[PDB]
Amino acid sequence: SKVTTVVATPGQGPDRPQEVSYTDTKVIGNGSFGVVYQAKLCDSGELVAIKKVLQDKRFKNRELQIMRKLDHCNIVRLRYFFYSSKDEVYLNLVLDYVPETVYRVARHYSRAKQTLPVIYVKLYMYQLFRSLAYIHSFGICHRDIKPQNLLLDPDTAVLKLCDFGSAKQLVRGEPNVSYICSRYYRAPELIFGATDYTSSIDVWSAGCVLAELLLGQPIFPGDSGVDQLVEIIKVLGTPTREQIREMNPNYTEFKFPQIKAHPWTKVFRPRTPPEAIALCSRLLEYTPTARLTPLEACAHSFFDELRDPNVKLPNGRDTPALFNFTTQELSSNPPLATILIPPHARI
Ligand SMILES: CC1(C)CC(=O)C2=C(C1)Nc1n[nH]c(C3CC3)c1[C@]2(C)c1ccccc1
């Protein structure tokens, strides 16, 4: 049937355009992220996703430039990119295809009034924390961490962060837009108009994802952008004057009734593991600098089961790769390696 041949640069690799042929074309996506097709590569028979976006030459594509740097087992890989079609041009990103997401899988459980087994919550969170450590080590903040942007192969349990359409290199002193992330996952800095925010917003969002996987629903289901704060206050209580300043130095008229935090253990279901709750509490903190780094989150005792030599997937198979760190990934705190790479995994 219908074969399409393009000339396409490999996404990471020397800058060397090659003829690439694909077939079995259909729309699988048309969202926030742009129009996306599934396609099958003629040589390997391998299924890929192709994001096709109108690209003006009067600037460079940010997402392109970000994806070209990334190479990590927990991040969607840009295989190739290519240009196509007025005198109108489309950038085309040829990306890994994965059939599921954490959102879809979680929804399947929740509709059945069920809880995702904690081992899967561990597997998924750990892998998201690694992807975050990795992108953060380049100054890149994703800014759209939510369950929908977590690709998931349901059989191997490998997770890949995708949709870098909101992502951006954060530079100290260059201001950035506040009204960013999906609402339920939006860090309170941002709700407070902060413009000097760091990559620790991704970690707040990661916190929310953890909480959602343990609750079986979003922890902060805001009716509206301002109401999102109200939902936060119902658990963390009101932030202090000093928390407000740490979130946004410009925020002054802070006129509010002081509300007590709800204790963390009563936020979750009766038998939730205490290591999970403790991990949450160190992610969902008003004060941006108080939140764990991704690398530290990875080293948290909540994830100790994954560092057991005898651990297995419930389907009987081996876990995916968890310990193949690079020195880039470890660069924020290289000694963490002694916890993160356990005895059994260096021979
Ligand atoms: C989740 C569904 C059923 C529908 C979808 O939009 C994607 C899928 C399969 N599978 C996908 N595999 N890879 C990709 C994107 C291009 C990298 C997708 C898509 C295009 C995606 C996933 C997550 C966020 C945005 C878009």
Describe the protein in words:
This protein has 347 residues and is an alpha+beta fold. It is 30% helix and 18% strand. The radius of gyration is 21 Å and the shape is globular. The protein starts with a strand and ends in a 7-residue tail after the last helix. The ligand CC1(C)CC(=O)C2=C(C1)Nc1n[nH]c(C3CC3)c1[C@]2(C)c1ccccc1 is lined by residues 28-29, 33, 36, 49, 51, 76, 95-99, 101, 148-149, 151, 162-163. The site of the ligand CC1(C)CC(=O)C2=C(C1)Nc1n[nH]c(C3CC3)c1[C@]2(C)c1ccccc1 has 18 residues, from strand 2, strand 4 and strand 6. It is classed as transferase/transferase inhibitor. Keywords: protein kinase, inhibitor, TRANSFERASE-TRANSFERASE INHIBITOR complex. It forms a monomeric assembly. The entry is titled "Glycogen Synthase Kinase 3 beta Complexed with BRD0209".
Can you describe this structure in just a few lines?
GO terms for molecular function: ATP binding; beta-catenin binding; dynactin binding; kinase activity; NF-kappaB binding; p53 binding; protease binding; protein kinase A catalytic subunit binding. The protein is α+β, with helices and mostly antiparallel strands.
